[PDB]
């Protein structure tokens, strides 16, 4: 699966999945915390195959 | 010179410096759309916060294109030179050096380009520090904005300077009638000389209060007029009061 | 009492986990000395964790943190909430640089190193009950909030002294813990009803840092050191930084403290693994296998593993 | 004499992800390796837009007295026209409230330099998604990902700002019964520059 | 199949989109393309009917406050949020249809509150200065106070130097011998750099 | 200047049609007709070229923002000083004459 | 003479300790026996920060 | 032959040849009408083959 990984001294910590539009935006800016503001989003199209 | 104005102004200044110093910390806690307007602490802090990272950037990416391979076997020239014949290796390193020199040409072009606007801005800044601080400017709103300039304080800031201009602001208005001028005997027009001064009468003769005072157009200092402040004109108008020698 | 405290955090029914930390033990269980700092083998390092259960005044609850070293560069913790009501118990929680006083009480100057405003500023609901208590614990970079649902925050700082604004409190009302304890937790009810909390005996540290809790969605639970985990890299490794990539993290089932592979256990990449999962289970075909190795000598001496390829080739280790 | 100056520029936004890939999953998975450029460009774009919008909104200063005195009736021309400059009052649209429209000279210049249906007017993006019509150029970059932000300031705001600014000179005392004649202001300026006896 | 998202292969070009029928008449060509390489319009040769295709995806903006997605702005009438309000040019989606009096995120004349309501930002009213007069009625200012303003300026920038020879070659002799053919660029860049610095 | 500001957007679409040493400019066309490997290499070339082009574009953007910043500063100064009050500098407002 | 209140606040607010604002000692880059930081990387590359 | 074609709704209209220096300049700027001013021209060399 795809997720955001932060490494400090070859230590795995602060995992964060991206299976969510909020999570997708969060890991689209490699930031755990995001400032308030306006951001672009793409309409979902993976529901139907 | 009754000194209540002095103490009121001083206590107002102390309160204002206290609350601006408080606003320096946790400004977003109670910031409004007015609090983030022009010439406000929030605007200055966000401008400097962004510009410091902007100036600290634009160097890291210069290392990046070195790793980029320009249609060659590898980005390491030592690796290529000792593994393949001199001819194609020379051609490939020629491509590498040409691409790298073009990239640094773009970089150096950006450098003096940045130098230009800082030249212009520093010219403006030295002008402003020469004119708004050491002396008093007669241009309305030039120092600070929309108000007369009294004095300023200068503080060192990372990669520049910060200006703290104190602007005096009115809060109340006094509304009084005005008089254009005087004609004695309706041939001798006694008229005020300096446009900056103005002569008014406090109220009217409704209860025998035809007292005349002169003051500036911004300060309310009713004071008795002086003979030397007026001039004599041979022509008179309808708007001038037709007084006599006894009432002079 | 302890049942509510354990039920604050949710755990799957088919799971057993050992918890280690400054858990509440007694109302007045305190140090026998006056030391507040930490050094070699530190036990009396001040109030490692504080818990509030009762009040005498009832005006409200306030907590704040400080340290004898008195480093103003780091953050400070301050929380306040109103009692006498579950809805009104919305705690205002602040990890911010509060200027406060260099001493205790309004008698000295404030902190002159506070340039930035704050980092953590939130409102967190809370509930008041006889057997329900509200607590905070700090340990190295980690700080955890024992109120409602669990909190984990990562920041390197030091603290050795605890201050309460509300002085009208008894000795037994406040509970301070300074020594970590190990307890085995076993909740086979999928709910607040915990079967037992027997203390762990052996291999407690290893069990704590190796056992997971399979969430229903398959996500990994928070609160793990990941000591025996490494990033999957073909070449080189990032010394420090952040990156996003596809990695083998989603788990279908987990097996720990094993016995059955000594009977020639067979795994197929096609069919779901069979065993007592550590909680929830997902019926999915495996993609990769991760092995947490405790002892190499066990594999070296009698451990025999053979790799069966899709073609049919055998690769014996 | 004439003088013309600019103060603002039209901002534009774009999403890199949709521009470089048309909804494919594997392509964006590959793109995830290199993304810091996208973050840089978008951070710069929205930061620059927000700061200039805030400062330009702070620039404007509005007086209601000038709004009252901007009308033709409220202005007492004395030997001066001020007709092609002053706006036309008493307009009742479908809203039902009196509004201010363009005067002669500016309405001439807009229709001279700006062709009707150009990009100066705000563009309705609903028609792009409505369909069943031959898509124009705007929908092309809408599908591409280029978003043309609405103008930070409306033309009506500029016109009312101009009306307020030009009414400052005639603004005499507070709650004035009648506007002071312009000839008196001209005499005042002449006396201010130098004394006169004529 | 019409009016549904589908994977289409028309005249050797394959794409993804919704195809629809348009009421346009054209007697030339078999397909029509834009400057983006997209074959949006094609004609049914047997009947003469024309069809246009639009992608099954869209780009939209969102307003993020605190820790959740509150504002969604788009051009489609379908959204997760319960309330869909039509505004001139677009659609807004929110979970609250109440008033917005204290917006948190403001741009131009449009402001959004924390609760999710949207509204029009009232125009800012500026200061007032009294115009010069020589007769009648004057509002002389009095009872002053302080207003401290802030200003920040830059004067200098950090300079940087580099040696091209060492940057392009890591101490090799043959490489620098080859480089000796073309060196005027290095002279130019350094002459600019140290001169500007000095 | 109105056409100058209205321009510099149309050409941004043009380079999308340009093919960067690849079979075709349509990524969907390439992905479903050739092996994943060379298709991935070619789309990497495509995305690198496109991102460089938009890097140049965005560099031009704030570059344009700079002079409009300076000019708007001058304009607000001029509207503050030449209109609401009377300037004592000869020729400053308008030119070669008192204002 | 040292910093007063407001400016000492603003430096420690906007500038993190150990950033590039302070002068960098290049002797440690040639000293060795330590994991080289980013500064030594462009020092070896040839970029000199005056 | 080479000429300037203007299309409006797939309709051929306003043909304009380029067998003349004036015509060459006219169709070098794809404009039927050209404003007065200065423009560059290349000396003829097609007379002799
Ligand atoms: C610039 O600023 C000064 C200082 O504030 C203003 O002077 C004040 O003017 C206001 C309104 O004109 C006064 O408010 C009311 O004044 C009434 C009459 O004023 C006389 O009495 C007061 C004492 O009450 C004196 O201070 C003043 O100089 C006059 O001698 C008062 O009768 C009113 O009293 C009411 O309020 C008081 C509390 O203050 C209550 O105890 C009373 O019961 C009653 O409800 C009221 O005060 C104000 O008093 C003036 N202050 C001073 C110090 O003079 C100027 O007017 C202002 N310039 C402007 C606006 O152009
Ligand atoms: C102090 O005292 C002086 C002296 O009276 C006042 O100044 C004004 O002086 C004039 C001349 O003595 C007074 O008379 C007015 O003259 C104005 C201009 O003179 C014209 O006179 C005739 C008749 O209008 C014209 O044909 C000729 O061409 C001149 O141009 C006139 O405008 C006035 O006319 C008004 O009254 C007549 C009726 O008599 C009407 O038909 C007109 O339409 C108009 O309404 C007038 O004749 C004048 O009265 C004096 N002014 C005042 C206000 O009385 C100073 O004004 C005064 N100062 C103060 C403060 O009171
Ligand atoms: C280190 O170096 C190694 C090389 O040794 C790299 O290993 C490669 O990793 C990639 C990424 O997973 C592998 O690519 C995968 O190939 C699968 C097999 O392809 C078949 O199926 C596809 C249809 O999906 C057919 O078109 C094709 O013809 C084959 O029949 C693909 O299936 C994978 O894509 C899909 O995988 C699953 C399957 O359901 C989906 O869930 C996914 O979402 C995805 O759609 C994938 O493309 C590649 O095979 C590996 N090579 C080798 C030799 O092992 C490492 O990636 C590299 N880096 C690291 C960090 O290790
Ligand atoms: C709109 O779309 C949303 C999600 O897309 C759907 O879900 C929720 O619907 C409710 C119904 O209106 C809305 O939230 C509710 O608001 C009520 C009144 O709001 C005021 O009071 C609250 C504090 O209680 C303030 O925070 C708020 O600002 C207002 O001042 C609350 O009373 C509700 O709380 C109740 O929630 C549940 C369910 O009713 C009860 O069991 C609780 O006991 C509690 O009393 C609730 O907060 C809102 O629209 C949606 N909520 C959220 C969080 O998004 C809706 O179905 C859909 N349609 C409508 C008409 O809302
Ligand atoms: C700024 O300065 C200019 C230049 O003077 C003013 O213009 C004149 O100002 C004076 C004084 O401000 C005005 O005189 C006033 O008239 C007002 C009219 O209201 C009454 O008018 C009649 C008069 O009896 C009444 O019948 C009627 O019902 C209105 O109530 C009043 O404020 C005064 O008149 C009388 O009002 C009441 C009611 O009668 C009495 O109790 C009073 O005692 C008073 O006698 C006052 O006389 C004059 O009219 C103005 N003329 C013009 C042409 O403008 C501006 O008004 C001034 N700006 C202001 C004040 O905002
Ligand atoms: C909670 O702890 C108890 C005790 O288990 C003890 O500790 C373990 C680490 C193992 O060493 C066990 O051997 C040891 O007894 C466990 O819960 C209970 O476990 C017993 C197993 O002895 C369950 O009895 C089973 O009943 C079924 C149905 O009759 C039989 O088929 C089995 O053969 C077995 O006898 C009992 O149902 C179970 N009860 C509950 C409430 O959990 C368990 O090990 C642990 N919980 C979890 C989730 O692991
Ligand atoms: C699991 O393995 C089976 C069989 O394939 C075997 O394993 C592969 C990894 C290869 O090594 C093969 O060489 C080897 O034989 C596969 O599943 C089979 O096919 C379907 C998939 O679910 C299932 O039955 C099918 O049902 C449909 C619908 O009725 C029929 O049309 C099919 O003919 C078939 O019967 C069943 O899981 C299984 N069926 C049989 C007969 O084996 C699959 O390739 C693999 N992976 C899975 C299932 O995810
Ligand atoms: C100038 O502004 C300051 C506030 O910025 C006004 O109050 C001053 O506040 C500081 C901190 O609150 C006081 O420091 C004191 O330090 C002693 C220890 O030395 C401590 O015991 C006190 O509790 C306090 O923290 C400082 O003394 C105080 N200044 C005073 C009282 O004069 C200050 O009043 C303002 N000065 C003027 C002239 O307006
Ligand atoms: C290498 O690995 C393959 C599997 O990947 C092994 O193939 C499997 O071998 C076992 C035993 O050798 C086979 O089991 C046999 O099944 C039959 C019934 O079919 C039973 O009668 C026998 O007694 C025995 O249990 C299994 O079928 C076979 N599987 C396949 C797919 O071939 C292979 O044996 C390994 N190599 C060696 C040398 O063991
Ligand atoms: C509360 O809202 C209604 C309508 O909802 C919105 O109101 C504004 C915030 C704006 O975003 C409108 O477009 C929305 O429809 C208000 O009624 C409107 O009021 C404005 C002026 O205030 C007027 O121009 C509209 O025509 C009105 N529309 C309708 C349908 O009546 C109402 O005034 C708001 N109440 C308060 C106290 O602000
Ligand atoms: C200015 O500071 C004082 C305290 O010194 C405070 O009471 C007042 O509200 C402040 N003013 C503003 C406008 O914030
Ligand atoms: C909640 O109720 C308690 C009762 O003790 C009171 O002290 C507190 O102020 C209340 N808080 C709010 C937000 O109403
Ligand atoms: C596993 O190894 C042991 C060795 O002690 C052996 O006795 C056993 O038979 C092996 N199991 C299988 C299934 O071969
Ligand atoms: C085309 O015809 C009219 C406009 O000419 C329009 O109302 C109608 O809906 C269209 N029919 C289609 C697109 O099938």
mmCIF file with all atom_site columns, N, CA, C and O and ligand atoms in Angstrom, chain B residues 14, chain C residues 106-110, ligand 8:
data_model
loop_
_atom_site.group_PDB
_atom_site.id
_atom_site.type_symbol
_atom_site.label_atom_id
_atom_site.label_alt_id
_atom_site.label_comp_id
_atom_site.label_asym_id
_atom_site.label_entity_id
_atom_site.label_seq_id
_atom_site.pdbx_PDB_ins_code
_atom_site.Cartn_x
_atom_site.Cartn_y
_atom_site.Cartn_z
_atom_site.occupancy
_atom_site.B_iso_or_equiv
_atom_site.pdbx_formal_charge
_atom_site.auth_seq_id
_atom_site.auth_comp_id
_atom_site.auth_asym_id
_atom_site.auth_atom_id
_atom_site.pdbx_PDB_model_num
ATOM   1  N N   . UNK B 1 14  ? 1.884  54.515 25.672 1.00 0.00 ? 14  UNK B N   1
ATOM   2  C CA  . UNK B 1 14  ? 2.290  53.335 26.431 1.00 0.00 ? 14  UNK B CA  1
ATOM   3  C C   . UNK B 1 14  ? 1.312  52.182 26.227 1.00 0.00 ? 14  UNK B C   1
ATOM   4  O O   . UNK B 1 14  ? 1.726  51.034 26.018 1.00 0.00 ? 14  UNK B O   1
ATOM   5  N N   . UNK C 2 106 ? 2.754  34.282 41.045 1.00 0.00 ? 106 UNK C N   1
ATOM   6  C CA  . UNK C 2 106 ? 3.118  35.568 40.434 1.00 0.00 ? 106 UNK C CA  1
ATOM   7  C C   . UNK C 2 106 ? 4.101  36.359 41.284 1.00 0.00 ? 106 UNK C C   1
ATOM   8  O O   . UNK C 2 106 ? 3.722  37.336 41.938 1.00 0.00 ? 106 UNK C O   1
ATOM   9  N N   . UNK C 2 107 ? 5.370  35.944 41.280 1.00 0.00 ? 107 UNK C N   1
ATOM   10 C CA  . UNK C 2 107 ? 6.401  36.596 42.074 1.00 0.00 ? 107 UNK C CA  1
ATOM   11 C C   . UNK C 2 107 ? 7.653  36.962 41.290 1.00 0.00 ? 107 UNK C C   1
ATOM   12 O O   . UNK C 2 107 ? 8.463  37.747 41.798 1.00 0.00 ? 107 UNK C O   1
ATOM   13 N N   . UNK C 2 108 ? 7.845  36.429 40.083 1.00 0.00 ? 108 UNK C N   1
ATOM   14 C CA  . UNK C 2 108 ? 9.058  36.694 39.319 1.00 0.00 ? 108 UNK C CA  1
ATOM   15 C C   . UNK C 2 108 ? 8.736  37.065 37.877 1.00 0.00 ? 108 UNK C C   1
ATOM   16 O O   . UNK C 2 108 ? 7.573  37.295 37.531 1.00 0.00 ? 108 UNK C O   1
ATOM   17 N N   . UNK C 2 109 ? 9.762  37.127 37.033 1.00 0.00 ? 109 UNK C N   1
ATOM   18 C CA  . UNK C 2 109 ? 9.605  37.531 35.642 1.00 0.00 ? 109 UNK C CA  1
ATOM   19 C C   . UNK C 2 109 ? 9.001  36.380 34.835 1.00 0.00 ? 109 UNK C C   1
ATOM   20 O O   . UNK C 2 109 ? 8.575  35.358 35.380 1.00 0.00 ? 109 UNK C O   1
ATOM   21 N N   . UNK C 2 110 ? 8.955  36.540 33.518 1.00 0.00 ? 110 UNK C N   1
ATOM   22 C CA  . UNK C 2 110 ? 8.421  35.539 32.604 1.00 0.00 ? 110 UNK C CA  1
ATOM   23 C C   . UNK C 2 110 ? 9.525  35.063 31.661 1.00 0.00 ? 110 UNK C C   1
ATOM   24 O O   . UNK C 2 110 ? 10.683 35.475 31.763 1.00 0.00 ? 110 UNK C O   1
HETATM 25 C C1  . LIG I 3 .   ? 7.238  48.990 30.418 1.00 0.00 ? 8   LIG I C1  1
HETATM 26 O O1  . LIG I 3 .   ? 6.563  47.771 30.058 1.00 0.00 ? 8   LIG I O1  1
HETATM 27 C C2  . LIG I 3 .   ? 6.548  46.760 31.078 1.00 0.00 ? 8   LIG I C2  1
HETATM 28 C C3  . LIG I 3 .   ? 5.831  45.570 30.481 1.00 0.00 ? 8   LIG I C3  1
HETATM 29 O O2  . LIG I 3 .   ? 6.346  45.245 29.196 1.00 0.00 ? 8   LIG I O2  1
HETATM 30 C C4  . LIG I 3 .   ? 5.867  47.302 32.335 1.00 0.00 ? 8   LIG I C4  1
HETATM 31 O O3  . LIG I 3 .   ? 5.861  46.362 33.408 1.00 0.00 ? 8   LIG I O3  1
HETATM 32 C C5  . LIG I 3 .   ? 7.074  45.624 33.668 1.00 0.00 ? 8   LIG I C5  1
HETATM 33 O O4  . LIG I 3 .   ? 6.769  44.220 33.604 1.00 0.00 ? 8   LIG I O4  1
HETATM 34 C C6  . LIG I 3 .   ? 7.865  43.332 33.870 1.00 0.00 ? 8   LIG I C6  1
HETATM 35 C C7  . LIG I 3 .   ? 7.344  41.926 33.681 1.00 0.00 ? 8   LIG I C7  1
HETATM 36 O O5  . LIG I 3 .   ? 5.967  41.833 34.020 1.00 0.00 ? 8   LIG I O5  1
HETATM 37 C C8  . LIG I 3 .   ? 8.396  43.591 35.274 1.00 0.00 ? 8   LIG I C8  1
HETATM 38 O O6  . LIG I 3 .   ? 9.474  42.704 35.560 1.00 0.00 ? 8   LIG I O6  1
HETATM 39 C C9  . LIG I 3 .   ? 9.429  42.337 36.963 1.00 0.00 ? 8   LIG I C9  1
HETATM 40 O O7  . LIG I 3 .   ? 10.558 41.546 37.334 1.00 0.00 ? 8   LIG I O7  1
HETATM 41 C C10 . LIG I 3 .   ? 10.618 41.282 38.747 1.00 0.00 ? 8   LIG I C10 1
HETATM 42 C C11 . LIG I 3 .   ? 11.933 40.591 39.049 1.00 0.00 ? 8   LIG I C11 1
HETATM 43 O O8  . LIG I 3 .   ? 12.987 41.516 38.819 1.00 0.00 ? 8   LIG I O8  1
HETATM 44 C C12 . LIG I 3 .   ? 9.388  40.437 39.141 1.00 0.00 ? 8   LIG I C12 1
HETATM 45 O O9  . LIG I 3 .   ? 9.393  40.219 40.543 1.00 0.00 ? 8   LIG I O9  1
HETATM 46 C C13 . LIG I 3 .   ? 8.086  41.150 38.724 1.00 0.00 ? 8   LIG I C13 1
HETATM 47 O O10 . LIG I 3 .   ? 6.962  40.326 39.017 1.00 0.00 ? 8   LIG I O10 1
HETATM 48 C C14 . LIG I 3 .   ? 8.114  41.560 37.252 1.00 0.00 ? 8   LIG I C14 1
HETATM 49 O O11 . LIG I 3 .   ? 8.054  40.366 36.492 1.00 0.00 ? 8   LIG I O11 1
HETATM 50 C C15 . LIG I 3 .   ? 8.836  45.044 35.370 1.00 0.00 ? 8   LIG I C15 1
HETATM 51 O O12 . LIG I 3 .   ? 9.317  45.350 36.673 1.00 0.00 ? 8   LIG I O12 1
HETATM 52 C C16 . LIG I 3 .   ? 7.665  45.966 35.044 1.00 0.00 ? 8   LIG I C16 1
HETATM 53 N N1  . LIG I 3 .   ? 8.087  47.357 35.110 1.00 0.00 ? 8   LIG I N1  1
HETATM 54 C C17 . LIG I 3 .   ? 7.735  48.189 36.094 1.00 0.00 ? 8   LIG I C17 1
HETATM 55 C C18 . LIG I 3 .   ? 6.854  47.612 37.163 1.00 0.00 ? 8   LIG I C18 1
HETATM 56 O O13 . LIG I 3 .   ? 8.107  49.358 36.121 1.00 0.00 ? 8   LIG I O13 1
HETATM 57 C C19 . LIG I 3 .   ? 6.525  48.599 32.786 1.00 0.00 ? 8   LIG I C19 1
HETATM 58 O O14 . LIG I 3 .   ? 5.804  49.155 33.879 1.00 0.00 ? 8   LIG I O14 1
HETATM 59 C C20 . LIG I 3 .   ? 6.566  49.605 31.646 1.00 0.00 ? 8   LIG I C20 1
HETATM 60 N N2  . LIG I 3 .   ? 7.250  50.817 32.067 1.00 0.00 ? 8   LIG I N2  1
HETATM 61 C C21 . LIG I 3 .   ? 6.715  52.037 31.956 1.00 0.00 ? 8   LIG I C21 1
HETATM 62 C C22 . LIG I 3 .   ? 7.564  53.173 32.441 1.00 0.00 ? 8   LIG I C22 1
HETATM 63 O O15 . LIG I 3 .   ? 5.598  52.216 31.481 1.00 0.00 ? 8   LIG I O15 1
#
